Amino acid sequence: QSRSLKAMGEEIWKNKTEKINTELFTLTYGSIVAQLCQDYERDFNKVNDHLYSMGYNIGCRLIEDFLARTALPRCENLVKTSEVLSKCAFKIFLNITPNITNWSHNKDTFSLILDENPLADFVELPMDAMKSLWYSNILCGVLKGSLEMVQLDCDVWFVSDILRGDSQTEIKVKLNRILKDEIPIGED
């Protein structure tokens, strides 16, 4: 238990990793969340796809840094993954520790309750998007790209965002398949 999962996650945030002001990132995200609403003339849904699309490209880059530091092996169950992601990923990147619940028979999917969202839990949604936007979609999209870069082919999506007056915040992360990787040179 040299590096319990929670403990590694915390040791990582504290003793070593580079940081920036939380507020600085918050506003930069706000420009992108807000910038898109103007650009997509109030079509909240167009934006979410946009953020989620943004989350994937960054997610692919980041999965690379995350592995570089924690040095974890490619977990084969969704569950080890659920655990690695919540104590390790969040703590290291957003000094946060989301939960893991609403698990379904087969370990199909597992939500990912974020009770404190450093990202944006201070916002007060305009009576517009209040019904369509998932402010933190880029966050969700980063997960999809990250899992995919380590073969887990999953489906990350919202069902609850405090922001939309929901009772909580819950990102579901379903597993679809595990991808293979090979090299044909000979008789193909």
Partner: protein
């Protein structure tokens, strides 16, 4: 002395980076294999819930300390049987050198591929970033 050569291996079974101390690219292809065949031999030949990986591979006159990714990036390096496992150096090379220069500036994408469904064979060591070659070559100045 020290290390003989550095090879980075793509997640497409492709070769991204070389090192001494076009003719060369083929040797990597088999080396990708020596690592590939042994890696799987090691994967099946394991007991536990960890799923063992090839730490080091030794020969009569050299060694290929390996370090593999969960995203799929074989960092291979061939020693000269003098120093211990360059596992940390390899690890550091990938974490300090690779992530920031290579995959943090989304202005010039990662050597991934050419969409072409010839991913393993196709693709040429597009990893070129002026910094990467410079910082890495400097990092391995002595050893």
């Amino acid at each position: 002395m020290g290390i003989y050569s550095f090879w980075i291996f793509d997640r497409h079974c492709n070769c991204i980076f070389d090192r001494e101390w076009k003719q060369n690219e083929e040797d990597a292809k088999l080396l990708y294999g020596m690592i590939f065949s042994l890696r799987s031999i090691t994967q099946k030949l394991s007991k536990g819930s960890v799923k063992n990986d090839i730490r080091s591979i030794s020969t009569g006159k050299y060694r290929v300390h390996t370090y593999c990714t969960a995203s799929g990036l074989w960092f291979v390096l061939l020693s000269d049987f003098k120093q211990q496992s360059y596992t940390q150096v390899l690890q550091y090379i990938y974490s300090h050198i690779y992530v920031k220069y290579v995959s943090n500036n989304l202005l010039s994408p990662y050597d991934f591929a050419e969409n072409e469904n010839e991913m393993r064979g196709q693709g040429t060591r597009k990893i070129t970033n002026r910094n990467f070659i410079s910082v890495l070559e400097s990092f391995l100045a002595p050893m």
